[PDB]
Design a protein around this ligand. Sequence first.
Ligand SMILES: CCn1c2ccc(C[NH2+]C)cc2c2ccc(-c3ccco3)cc21
Ligand SMILES: [Zn+2]
Length: 197
Amino acid sequence: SVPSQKTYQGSYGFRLGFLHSGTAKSVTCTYSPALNKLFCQLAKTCPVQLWVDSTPPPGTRVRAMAIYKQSQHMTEVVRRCPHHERCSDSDGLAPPQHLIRVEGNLRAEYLDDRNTFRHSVVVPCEPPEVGSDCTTIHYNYMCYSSCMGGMNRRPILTIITLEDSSGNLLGRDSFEVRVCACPGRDRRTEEENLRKK
Ligand SMILES: CCn1c2ccc(C[NH2+]C)cc2c2ccc(-c3ccco3)cc21
Ligand SMILES: [Zn+2]
């Protein structure tokens, strides 16, 4: 089956936010609102903001999962390629097969779904630090979009779900991801292609 990607703010007004990092050749992570697409380098920090209009209950969690965007591939599990799953870059918590990691959160849990075999990473939802307006999760993507035997140039989406302590849905948002060597140039190219279209 295919997990839902429907945007759903839910009772708490849940949605994502992204920094404005620009498109310089040196940028390591940059988000395109026009494409709803994050462009990032391999294994580099991707800050994703969480916003709500009202306070959710203790025990609320935030899960991230990748799926293929194209209909002809959506049923295939997104995983790291045959090289990267074996390169011993473990952080001590993430299974080596998982594309998406959370950086710097010892409460992150990694799920291999016993029925769908899909991978996800989930953390407790936390209020913003004192003086901040939102909460940020730092994600890493551990293969290139181009990796042969893995994503193999197929576009993916990341689905972020706000969940209760049982795993029931409270909110959902999503964004496309390209993991690439030059996110700034690729964002500029894809935005210009969109404008020409
Ligand atoms: C989703 C992260 N986030 C926010 C993000 C933005 C804002 C608005 N600021 C102007 C408030 C919150 C917030 C309030 C409570 C909790 C919370 C309580 C228990 C667990 O999580 C989590 C929260
Ligand atoms: Zn790879």
